[PDB]
Design a protein around this ligand. Sequence first.
Ligand code: X0S
Ligand code: ZN
Length: 140
Amino acid sequence: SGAIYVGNYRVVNRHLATHNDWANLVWEDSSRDLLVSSTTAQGCDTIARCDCQTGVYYCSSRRKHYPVSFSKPSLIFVEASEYYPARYQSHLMLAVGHSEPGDCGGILRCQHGVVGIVSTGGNGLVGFADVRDLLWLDEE
Ligand SMILES: CNS(=O)(=O)c1ccccc1Cl
Ligand SMILES: [Zn+2]
């Protein structure tokens, strides 16, 4: 679990979105495993605007933050998980590291702020859904 709180926006994994998220929907994309809903309170997070390939992510299943190198956002084949079939996921970044299903929502950050959230794992990789292209998160 986990979300990004930027302005009056909540960014979650689409597969973990609540009824309240869907009832307050701003934007969702299944191919990216992202959903954004409206908030009443303003949030503490800053979105990275950058092409960093190094940063740090939170892994709830280790209670640890790990420094990683990660690929640039790409269209990647993902094997079946408890929450999705085998399918192609867009805007996905991969690193070498530990990720189980409950680790989804964990933040990946770089020197510029929040890069994305854990979305995939298995086979010694963790995949992160990028949010750095979502410029509209920073306004309105
Ligand atoms: C797998 N998706 S993707 O290649 O990251 C991508 C798709 C559409 C627009 C921009 C990008 Cl980066
Ligand atoms: Zn950066």
